[PDB]
Amino acid sequence: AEPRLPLMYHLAAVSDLSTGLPSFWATGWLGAQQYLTYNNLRQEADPCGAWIWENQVSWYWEKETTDLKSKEQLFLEAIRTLENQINGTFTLQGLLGCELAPDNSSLPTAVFALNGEEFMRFNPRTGNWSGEWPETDIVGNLWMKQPEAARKESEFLLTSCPERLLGHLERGRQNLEWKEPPSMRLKARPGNSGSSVLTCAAFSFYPPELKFRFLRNGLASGSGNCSTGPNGDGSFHAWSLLEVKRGDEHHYQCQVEHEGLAQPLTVDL
Amino acid sequence: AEPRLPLMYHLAAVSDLSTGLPSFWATGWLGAQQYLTYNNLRQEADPCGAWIWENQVSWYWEKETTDLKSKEQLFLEAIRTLENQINGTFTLQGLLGCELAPDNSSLPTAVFALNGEEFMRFNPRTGNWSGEWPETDIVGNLWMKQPEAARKESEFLLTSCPERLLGHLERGRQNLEWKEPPSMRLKARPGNSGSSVLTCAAFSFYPPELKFRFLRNGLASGSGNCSTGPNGDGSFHAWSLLEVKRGDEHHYQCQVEHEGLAQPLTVDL
Amino acid sequence: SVFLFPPKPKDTLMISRTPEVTCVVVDVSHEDPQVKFNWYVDGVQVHNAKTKPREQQYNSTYRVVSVLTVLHQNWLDGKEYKCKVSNKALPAPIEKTISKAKGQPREPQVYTLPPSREEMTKNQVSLTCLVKGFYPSDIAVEWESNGQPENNYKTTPPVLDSDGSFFLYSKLTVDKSRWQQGNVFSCSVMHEALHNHYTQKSLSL
Amino acid sequence: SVFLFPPKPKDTLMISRTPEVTCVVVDVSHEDPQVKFNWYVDGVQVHNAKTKPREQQYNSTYRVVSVLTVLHQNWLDGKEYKCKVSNKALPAPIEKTISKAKGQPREPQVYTLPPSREEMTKNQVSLTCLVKGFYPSDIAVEWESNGQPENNYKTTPPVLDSDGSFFLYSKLTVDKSRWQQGNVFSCSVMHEALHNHYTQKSLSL
Amino acid sequence: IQKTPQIQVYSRHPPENGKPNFLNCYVSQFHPPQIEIELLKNGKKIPNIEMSDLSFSKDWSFYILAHTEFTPTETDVYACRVKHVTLKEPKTVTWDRDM
Amino acid sequence: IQKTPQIQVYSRHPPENGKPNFLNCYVSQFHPPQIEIELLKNGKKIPNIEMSDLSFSKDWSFYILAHTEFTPTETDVYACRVKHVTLKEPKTVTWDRDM
Ligand SMILES: *[C@@H]1O[C@H](CO[C@H]2O[C@H](C)[C@@H](O)[C@@H](O)[C@@H]2O)[C@@H](O[C@@H]2O[C@H](CO)[C@@H](O[C@@H]3O[C@H](CO[C@H]4O[C@H](CO)[C@@H](O)[C@H](O)[C@@H]4O[C@@H]4O[C@H](CO)[C@@H](O[C@@H]5O[C@H](CO)[C@H](O)[C@H](O)[C@H]5O)[C@H](O)[C@H]4NC(C)=O)[C@@H](O)[C@H](O[C@H]4O[C@H](CO)[C@@H](O)[C@H](O)[C@@H]4O[C@@H]4O[C@H](CO)[C@@H](O)[C@H](O)[C@H]4NC(C)=O)[C@@H]3O)[C@H](O)[C@H]2NC(C)=O)[C@H](O)[C@H]1NC(C)=O
Ligand SMILES: *[C@@H]1O[C@H](CO[C@H]2O[C@H](C)[C@@H](O)[C@@H](O)[C@@H]2O)[C@@H](O[C@@H]2O[C@H](CO)[C@@H](O[C@@H]3O[C@H](CO[C@H]4O[C@H](CO)[C@@H](O)[C@H](O)[C@@H]4O[C@@H]4O[C@H](CO)[C@@H](O[C@@H]5O[C@H](CO)[C@H](O)[C@H](O)[C@H]5O)[C@H](O)[C@H]4NC(C)=O)[C@@H](O)[C@H](O[C@H]4O[C@H](CO)[C@@H](O)[C@H](O)[C@@H]4O[C@@H]4O[C@H](CO)[C@@H](O)[C@H](O)[C@H]4NC(C)=O)[C@@H]3O)[C@H](O)[C@H]2NC(C)=O)[C@H](O)[C@H]1NC(C)=O
């Protein structure tokens, strides 16, 4: 089983609702795949796509919904207090999760930001919050005002996270060990004065790790200016650009590496 | 008798004795003549020149010496306190005296200065000191610290002064009503490019009031740039300057008026 | 002439705020208004990096200002904010570098001082906060009533003490009654060498 | 460029002192050092009137200053102290008029503030004098111990309050022991609108 | 701390005119999270599109995926219009078939 | 407030060479009262002169009279030298016979 691959949570809250955003919302991730979604308007933790066929214990989803309702409260409250002491509008975010140590225990993560900058951390092995700015005090003090908060935060991170991760590697093995290989295409178009641009594009693959190498007359030539993006259904899409001298195109090939392929795959114009 | 002619006192104290000055000294005046002198080193009030033949009551001079010893004290003390609170060196002065009203009573004067500027006054009919500067407080407060000071100051001014003045008009009539007429001389010398300067000079007269008028061909021509000064023995000396065109001198005469003369006196080059 | 100002300390401190490095040039001239602002951060040119020059028409000349917005993190980690003004009436690119201090910070001393008894003979009193022994001069003091902003305050400029530190006073004028009713007041000081760049000290009857 | 400064208020107030109107020009140049100072008082030219320019050799240029001494009386009665600088490299006689205020004076409020209790945890404390609501900004504060000068003080610049008045603070740092021994301290304020241009307020344990 | 978005348009399967596919606009690197996003056909808004859950990255900036079913033709222009505070006028980005 | 002195030299009786008279130096208009004053004969100090009591006027400035017995001649120069703070170098004033 893919021992230890990260389980991570993304959390946010905002004061300005002029573009129709929820006041609080969260997403959860196993490595690169998102397995959960949640917002204050539905108050339910629902599985994402493929994760709905996973054999889980009868109480799996009820328990995720509970932990998330707790967080929602601590976040929405932090905003009102900030609104009271300082003029403006605010955006609050958090990053929380874990990864498995070889003996199977936890190595956690917990950080926070206010209006685009990191302003606070939380060490679960001590139960304390830290910072360096005036708003750290306002927020940290508000959260300390009920000791259980800190205690339940250390447990989510050092106990629940690793048990969830460990159950996912097993019950969700088919999902994690999938290698849908990429579908390839290579094309050329006009560039700047006297130049041409080649674009190697990769469709529908999983996992997201893929390597590009361009070849001029069968010899390694660089990897080009590359990028990746989500594909709307579980798989990914990527592309790399290379500038060549006009008239020079037919000398190049594109080659990619991927865990879903038995050996590299050479592509032709 | 010359009713009311002023009796006035000049008082001073200094911190710097590098030029051999006494710490305190005073001079007293009847109109324009000085009849008394006093300093802290002799501590005696002595008559000046002609005033030694005046028939006075047996206690006249002992009483002047007493009043002056009092003042000496108030003045020398004011300097030490100023020296204590402010760095520097100081010079303190006063002007005190009176003149007779027709019914024979007093119209007094009492003013003070510090380092060249007036900083305080004293109204004898109320017994109070006034000012407008930080050092007024330091000095005025120091002098109030013994109520009798104020009381003895109002008496010197409203009672003693007028009785002294009234005794002087009588016992010293020959001295006050003297009119030694001026001895005259008129001369010419070189001036600026193309000019000449005439100088009319008046020797040994009393009183100090004298009027100068220059005449060109028997006709009033101005009074010239005039000045007066003491003569070392009781009488005065004066002089007036007139600028004329070179070669024009013999047209001018000098004429003076004085209480010691039966009618104006015309002078020739 | 090209002046270059820092972000307000509060604005680099608070993630809820937005820090700006303002390059104020006064002149440029007519016939040559074409002042190409150049903005560099550490080494690198930032293009715009949301640089925003807005033209003003003053005196007998032009007053031109471009405002580079800064990442809180970068300025706190002290990058160099280099402003450069071009033109042709101008033989040389007028260069200007700012960053923060670089150090050695001294933590401010915040004591709050009640009105004098002689001042309770007035029916408006004054509340005083002494903030001393800080470095650099870059500080921000504010006042609150009970828990909320008081707009009624005057702060003196940081002035250098015998120490080689800076100090200031800030004077909250409240109503004699408003003090006498045992109402809580507070001065809230923000400086680099404070606990989270922030502290607060309370005045109560 | 010709700047013209007033006499120090203490020095026009105290007859024991001597007031001076200082005309500080910075430039003049070489080849044309020949700056004929011209000093006028009300209307009249004063020749010297004990005018005393003393040459300095600075920067890359000359720093020339002439000091006209003033009669206490005249300045208090507000005459115009007109400085004029000549030369030939200079197409026009650079004219400058000073005098005092002309008014409307506001009398300062002098309250003396003890150290805070939290500051008696330090073994040097601070003594504060608040001087408020004066006009013009032309003031002079000083401190004394028991009856004699304390050199250990720092005064803030007059800063304009909401009122349209000026205010300042002055901070005497003494030894905790020196305060605790019930020793008398005092701030001595000098401003035009005070009783004799002078006042004093005492701090004692 | 404000950050302008990065905008990238692309397709699911290798494109071919007249053949059913899915259009994808991936908007990322932005702050704040208040943003407007529409899919355009010949400069006019397409009705009823889908969107993924809004998320963010290790550097805190936000990211999300708008998408819908479409059939490419040789004449029809497809784009992605986005409004955000950092933008005085909205930004329109056109779909590039080699991507 | 400082004030430089005014200095005026003159004689008692109308002058005549070879005839006994009295020389007078009247120093006035000064402040402070610390001042040095000497009578000179051919630039060198005359010994044993007299002085009146030091006084002052309605405007506060001081005044005094130095004097002595002398016989004018045609060749001998008489002056009055004065030192005071307002003076960087002392001032010497020569006797003018038409005064
Ligand atoms: C033609 O006219 C124009 C305009 O004139 C006005 O008046 C006319 C009568 C009228 O007709 C109109 O024309 C117009 O109304 C003249 O322009 C003036 O030009 C002079 C220079 O010649 C400038 O003077 C300089 O000022 C600097 C300080 O500037 C601030 O204060 C002034 C006064 O209040 C403001 O005017 C100015 O705008 C500045 O305010 C600050 O601005 C910034 C940017 O907006 C604010 O930023 C904040 O940013 C954060 C970001 O998060 C946040 O967004 C906040 O909300 C923002 O507010 C900041 O807050 C403002 N500050 C405050 C308190 O609010 C001086 O520093 C400068 O002095 C230095 O240089 C000179 C020259 O070398 C030296 O002599 C001087 O000593 C000093 O040198 C050294 O400087 C170091 C840095 O300061 C210092 O540490 C060091 O100790 C020092 N060295 C020594 C030895 O002391 C200088 O005085 C004027 O500012 C400018 N006026 C205006 C209105 O812009 C023009 O000259 C004229 N042409 C002629 C006459 O030919
Ligand atoms: C070449 O170099 C020289 C010297 O440079 C030094 O540094 C180099 C690095 C080095 O190499 C050497 O060369 C050298 O060490 C440059 O000279 C400088 O030039 C500038 C102008 O370009 C001058 O700046 C002006 O300063 C005025 C204030 O001046 C006082 O403070 C400064 C700073 O401390 C002192 O330096 C200065 O000496 C002044 O101190 C006061 O002096 C008087 C006279 O001695 C004292 O008098 C007392 O008198 C009583 C009498 O009884 C008693 O005797 C006391 O004992 C005496 O002490 C007085 O006490 C002193 N004060 C104190 C506190 O001690 C500024 O006012 C002036 O600013 C005005 O004008 C400018 C220009 O228009 C405006 O921009 C500015 O806004 C302001 O305008 C208006 O002014 C009004 C009046 O102030 C004001 O009310 C109004 O609000 C204001 N308007 C506005 C809109 O704000 C200006 O800043 C420097 O002073 C001068 N430096 C020196 C050392 O002299 C030279 O430029 C350079 N050449 C170049 C670069 O080309």
Ligand SMILES: *[C@@H]1O[C@H](CO[C@@H]2O[C@@H](C)[C@@H](O)[C@@H](O)[C@@H]2O)[C@@H](O)[C@H](O)[C@H]1NC(C)=O
């Ligand atoms: C490859 O990239 C070089 C530098 O950066 C690139 O362009 C900037 C604007 C961003 O898009 C950045 O993310 C890219 O990595 C360019 O100088 C170069 O022109 C690019 N070359 C080609 C052929 O596209």
Ligand SMILES: *[C@@H]1O[C@H](CO[C@@H]2O[C@@H](C)[C@@H](O)[C@@H](O)[C@@H]2O)[C@@H](O)[C@H](O)[C@H]1NC(C)=O
């Ligand atoms: C007469 O006086 C005019 C103006 O004042 C005089 O000179 C000054 C210097 C002082 O001495 C002052 O007390 C004098 O009154 C002169 O302009 C004029 O030249 C003088 N004329 C003559 C002929 O001496």
Ligand SMILES: *[C@@H]1O[C@H](CO)[C@@H](O)[C@H](O)[C@H]1NC(C)=O
């Ligand atoms: C880690 O956990 C798995 C499942 O419990 C187990 O098979 C594996 O041996 C564990 N490793 C150690 C070192 O405990």
Ligand SMILES: *[C@@H]1O[C@H](CO)[C@@H](O)[C@H](O)[C@H]1NC(C)=O
């Ligand atoms: C003024 O006093 C003299 C002397 O006592 C006296 O002769 C004269 O008549 C008095 N005048 C009046 C009005 O009392």
